Amino acid sequence: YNVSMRDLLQAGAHFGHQTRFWNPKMRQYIFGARNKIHIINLEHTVPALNDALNFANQLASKKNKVLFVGTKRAASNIIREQAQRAGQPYVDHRWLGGMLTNWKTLRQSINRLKDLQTQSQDGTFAKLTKREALERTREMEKLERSLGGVKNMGGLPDALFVIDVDHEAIAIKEAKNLGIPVIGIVDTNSNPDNVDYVIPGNDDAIRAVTLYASAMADAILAGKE
RNA sequence: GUCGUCAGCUCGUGUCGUGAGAUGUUGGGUUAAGUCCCGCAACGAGCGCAACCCUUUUCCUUACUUGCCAGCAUUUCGGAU
């Protein structure tokens, strides 16, 4: 399931953002700049990626939980497919404030969505008229769109996998508050302070995030115990 | 009585602040209305608004007197009989 770095170079993980937006805390991984943008050297990318894959493998083996989080328009469908075929919950859409630190109140909306799914399997809408059916379907739509990811999961996940740490900084803070480890993809214009396993690489490239999430899903599938 | 039939007034978990506090309740449209929809460290609730009450506008059922008179008959031409 390892990438070696053939595929990383092919996908384009080395590319980064412009030199005027960089965070001075990535100087170790900056390596150099071919043009006005930075180029992270994959020499540092591959070992951290391998360790992240091994850690995901070990958690999958001991049955511990990892949540998936990527909310960018580029990575939304990618994490959709990968979390679906890896059988883990996900946050494809916006992170809700306090989803982890205030899980008790979110369980109520989780139960509401699950009960509404049971009602959808039921037939009460046949007795009700078309209008109230149209609304109840639209609350169905909004709650599924917001928190349809985490309905199956019943507790705090034992780890987080973050596509863009700068975009999902709130989830990073909540995970730090509750002690949950985080493995995340970090680019040049990002802060790696609060991430336990810092893998540096590009996040804008759809093919690169596809590679990362496919590697993660393959690791969890290959846990197989 | 009045502001004034003005549209607002609050509470519980979670975050920020040493703190009193803030957030939610803000921002974009819309409405008679904190009425409804989006985004958004917020996630949820109560009293307010609206509806439930009375009256008016169309039709149906039940009811046929002290109220009614389309058809029939008698009329002093008055449903008078």
Side-chain angles (χ1 to χ4, degrees):
Chain A
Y1 33 73
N2 306 43
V3 196
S4 150
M5 71 93 42
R6 325 320 74 200
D7 310 5
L8 285 170
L9 217 176
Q10 288 271 332
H14 62 287
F15 290 125
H17 291 68
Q18 302 181 50
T19 35
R20 69 130 72 169
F21 295 121
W22 79 319
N23 195 312
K25 260 140 145 61
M26 305 282 282
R27 194 152 22 201
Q28 304 143 30
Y29 325 101
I30 283 270
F31 167 77
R34 221 108 74 192
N35 203 38
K36 287 340 172 141
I37 41 59
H38 278 303
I39 287 90
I40 324 107
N41 53 341
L42 302 325
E43 161 75 9
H44 284 118
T45 310
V46 316
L49 193 33
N50 293 342
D51 301 296
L53 295 177
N54 298 338
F55 178 78
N57 265 331
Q58 298 157 16
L59 289 284
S61 297
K62 54 184 133 308
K63 327 205 92 53
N64 285 341
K65 226 296 199 183
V66 46
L67 181 63
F68 275 48
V69 291
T71 77
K72 319 172 56 84
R73 263 193 201 261
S76 200
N77 68 89
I78 283 90
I79 53 92
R80 197 79 305 281
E81 292 143 19
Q82 309 298 36
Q84 280 285 33
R85 56 66 64 91
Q88 297 289 41
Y90 59 92
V91 181
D92 48 36
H93 297 123
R94 58 171 299 251
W95 190 262
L96 259 51
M99 171 155 34
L100 279 169
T101 44
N102 195 205
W103 178 249
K104 318 175 262 152
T105 61
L106 199 77
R107 294 155 62 51
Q108 302 172 7
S109 289
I110 290 327
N111 294 351
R112 184 29 65 75
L113 181 65
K114 291 264 63 158
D115 164 273
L116 283 198
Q117 286 195 340
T118 60
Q119 280 183 3
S120 188
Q121 181 60 56
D122 296 351
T124 70
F125 326 119
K127 317 312 166 174
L128 277 299
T129 205
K130 304 309 173 179
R131 304 166 290 102
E132 53 255 5
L134 194 40
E135 29 271 39
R136 315 316 176 290
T137 47
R138 72 154 104 193
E139 317 81 303
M140 214 39 171
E141 286 173 7
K142 44 169 38 55
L143 289 101
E144 178 70 16
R145 186 281 168 203
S146 317
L147 57 58
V150 278
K151 52 181 164 43
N152 48 328
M153 155 159 69
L156 279 36
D158 284 337
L160 257 79
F161 163 67
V162 176
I163 277 304
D164 195 355
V165 314
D166 228 23
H167 201 278
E168 278 98 46
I170 293 210
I172 304 307
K173 178 78 199 312
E174 294 198 27
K176 183 215 280 293
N177 189 333
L178 307 164
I180 281 79
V182 172
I183 56 140
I185 311 307
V186 56
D187 208 340
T188 52
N189 59 340
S190 282
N191 185 5
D193 275 354
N194 308 299
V195 154
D196 312 40
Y197 296 85
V198 184
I199 135 135
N202 189 7
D203 47 304
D204 288 27
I206 58 135
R207 55 181 299 190
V209 48
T210 299
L211 179 151
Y212 299 138
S214 303
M216 200 61 12
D218 292 351
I220 197 193
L221 278 165
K224 48 84 208 164
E225 60 209 42

